[PDB]
């Protein structure tokens, strides 16, 4: 029944603590986001991380990957209206790191200010 720290989406998501504050350790998701998704998982917030079997995990991750259809009104996601396509993404642990990393490159190729700041600044 009791399960502690788990390894999925490449991150050692901690056990034995409050349910919201386990997910926040993942890059790209935080206190409000792990709050609201734990509301949208239809799981109580006073439950701990010792619970949450695999199906309860699959509902959470299932919601977060398509957040606009499980009632998130597209003002709550982190990286909305991408400059590539126009869609609304919520970038996650290693999508967020290279997603935010490549933006420097797309401001270097165009020769924008901030990219050149980080170019000659290093």
């Amino acid at each position: 029944s009791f399960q502690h720290i788990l390894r999925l989406l490449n991150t050692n998501v901690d056990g034995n603590i409050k349910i919201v504050y386990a997910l926040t350790t993942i890059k790209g998701v935080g206190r409000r986001y792990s709050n609201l998704v734990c509301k949208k998982a239809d799981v109580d917030l006073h439950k701990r991380a010792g619970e949450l079997t695999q199906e309860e995990l699959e509902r959470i991750v299932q919601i977060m990957q398509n957040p606009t259809h499980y009632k998130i009104p597209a003002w709550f996601l982190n990286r909305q209206n991408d400059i590539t396509d126009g869609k609304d993404y919520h970038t996650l642990a290693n999508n967020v790191e290279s997603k935010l990393r490549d933006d420097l490159e797309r401001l270097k190729k165009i020769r924008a200010h901030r990219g050149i700041r980080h170019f000659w600044g290093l």
Binding site: N81, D82, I83, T84, D85, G86, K87, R106, K109, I110, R111, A112, H113, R114, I116, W120, G121
Partner: protein, 117 residues
């Protein structure tokens, strides 16, 4: 893959300018550049058409020395060359198609770095 502006490709990259190009753009463009009613011909529209008209047969268009940094890159100046005066002489910058959604001021750097070494 070409420059999908925000899900916008080539023909409607070239003409949606100033009417509905400003519509699908971020917050500093839409209602913000419901304003931007400035002297946009200046010596800009005439050199914008004559200077890109001054690219015959695989050639840089004629660089425009100008006195602006604040103008957002328009879809008509896609593939232009513009000198951007940054406190010293008209420092020539080519315009690229991926440059839309940015300021003319962000390319010509005004200050030099501190240069230790």
């Amino acid at each position: 893959k070409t420059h999908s502006y925000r899900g916008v490709d080539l023909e409607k990259l070239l003409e949606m300018s100033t009417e509905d190009f400003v519509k699908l753009a971020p917050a500093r463009v839409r209602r913000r550049f419901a304003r931007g009613m400035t002297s946009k011909p200046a010596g800009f529209m005439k050199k914008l058409r004559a200077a890109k008209l001054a690219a015959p047969e695989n050639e840089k268009p004629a660089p425009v020395r100008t006195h602006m940094r604040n103008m957002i890159i328009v879809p008509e100046m896609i593939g232009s060359v513009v000198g951007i005066y940054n406190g010293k002489a008209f420092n020539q910058v080519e315009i690229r198609p991926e440059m839309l959604g940015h300021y003319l001021g962000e390319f010509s750097i005004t200050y030099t770095p501190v240069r230790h070494g």
